[PDB]
Symmetry: C2
Subunit: 313 residues, 2 copies
């Protein structure tokens, strides 16, 4: 019978200290009020500019598995009870964002009120959303501003981007003249964004928009698109995460995300940790942002009622 | 007879745009009120924690050559009329900083009033100091806070440092357990400073203080020295400078600093430009911070009454 106490002893090891985990990573303040069958609205994680109709398909401790109504279960995904890119039924209508209805339906005709009755289902209550009354820190970022952004789907490339929306303390990065498939949400301290002129001065090759870098001028482009660059003072410095090699923690199995496993910090860089699942081969290691809501301190699973997968026997 | 107009034409070249130069680099707002013989107080540029008695030895356009009273002329140095690390007679006494008197004198016995009469000289008036009433931007930096700083004298090395003083919007970086010879003044956006934990996560080797990195803990050290780390949010992002290769500008000859020469941006990095003096061999090129008060737009010398050395014949 395995426990963290004796495991730390035998292994002569140490946990990543609790104080290094941020609010969404650490022990939650409250219970998981979500119930299977509850419906809500959510950003499609692979199409981050798109809002979708979602149902809680499963609940596990402080986490929920969400399902795209009327679509295949292969798209299902797990987030914690306090996730940021989920909203209550009605939020899209309230804020004027476009809501993708379930499969078979027309966007115009969809009507939550009738849909909830048909499905004999309740919407998750508004109290559950940790994002209903977020304290808005002042920011230099505004919709329309341009900048230089890593393509998260191809992180080798830095590209011309624009802020196309803002919600609470987050904003949506969109790559000019590309499909919205590559959009992503981040904040002002993101290590994946830089002011215009960054690439040139760091000897990196800026990917310019399709239909247009050996000539490209930011100035000409800003002028022709009647746009402003995000001011440099708007960007913030990402605090060092302080995670060290060999420290222990609990982390979601990216590949079988129903599980959380005992893990070790194998490696570290300026904004990522390389996680190793104890007892597994090293080819199951992987890199994840050190601020990720899917890594947690020792004890998280216990305190929140989620099973911890012990080290592979 | 050489002029910038015809030189730009013949060379088929372009000036660095005026708008890229910062306030201390660009055309000044007022004349140079300094006069030879005027006395003042100044930071010793090679010992930046030390204040010294200085005399204006020469005036050229908007610049002044300053002399350390009673010491060798080899120490003389040039700054612009609006320099930051010069202060009026009496400033050290006003602010409680230690003033190094001229050679031969005792620090305690030195007395500006009697010294000015003996030398039959006037102190530069307080109006001349662009630093007398500087608008103080709010900052997270406070005296005592620790951080990681490049050694500017050996910029290969990042080392453990502390903020040991603050004046207007600048602060003094001091390397723990080293001589003060390595101190230097900077601001919150300096590319030479980073929060604690930076080095470890960027695969750099932090130089720890003498008398103490394969074991070093920032936490233990902060605790034992009863000190706080400068918060990450206090650091700011250095705006890209926008200087491009082949662009023309005017710049001080670092090696014979009485002269300002026609120059070309030869190379660029994240915070520096490599200047080339037109007509000279490439072995006279050198690197300088792109925010340096010694590089200026085409026309600076004309408008301020400083001679421009044309391209070497
Ligand atoms: Co569709
Ligand atoms: Co577009
Ligand atoms: Co797709
Ligand atoms: Co990254
Ligand atoms: Co970094
Ligand atoms: Co002395
Ligand atoms: Co010291
Ligand atoms: Co010395
Ligand atoms: Co440097
Ligand atoms: Co940089």
């Amino acid at each position: 019978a395995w426990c963290w106490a004796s495991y730390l002893e035998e292994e002569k090891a140490v946990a990543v200290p609790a104080k290094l985990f941020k609010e969404h990573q650490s022990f939650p303040y409250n219970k998981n009020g979500f119930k299977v069958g509850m419906k809500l609205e959510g950003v499609d994680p692979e199409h981050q500019s798109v809002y979708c109709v979602l149902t809680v398909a499963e609940v596990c401790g402080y986490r929920i598995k969400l399902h795209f109504d009327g679509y295949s279960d292969c798209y299902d995904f797990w987030v914690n009870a306090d996730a940021l890119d989920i909203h209550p039924v009605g939020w899209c209508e309230k804020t004027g964002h476009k809501l993708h209805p379930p499969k078979g339906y027309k966007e115009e005709e969809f009507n939550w009120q009738t849909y909830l009755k048909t499905c004999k289902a309740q919407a998750a209550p508004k109290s559950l959303f940790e994002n209903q009354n977020i304290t808005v820190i002042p920011s230099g970022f505004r919709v329309g501003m341009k900048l230089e952004a890593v393509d998260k789907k191809n992180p080798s490339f830095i590209c011309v981007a624009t802020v196309t929306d803002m919600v609470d303390n987050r904003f949506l990065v969109h790559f000019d003249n590309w499909d919205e498939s590559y959009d992503y949400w981040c904040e002002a301290s993101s290590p994946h964004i830089h002011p215009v002129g960054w690439c040139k001065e760091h000897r990196r090759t800026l990917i310019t928009p399709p239909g247009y870098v050996k000539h490209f001028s930011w100035d000409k482009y800003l002028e022709e698109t009647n746009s402003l660059p995000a001011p440099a003072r708007a960007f913030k410095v990402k605090p060092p995460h302080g995670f060290q090699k060999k420290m222990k923690l609990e982390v979601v199995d990216k590949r079988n995300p129903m599980f959380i496993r005992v893990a070790t910090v194998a490696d570290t860089d300026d904004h990522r940790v390389k996680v190793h699942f104890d007892g597994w081969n090293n080819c199951y290691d992987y890199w994840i942002d050190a601020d990720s809501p899917d890594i947690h301190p020792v004890g998280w699973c216990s305190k929140t009622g989620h099973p911890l997968q012990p080290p592979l026997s």
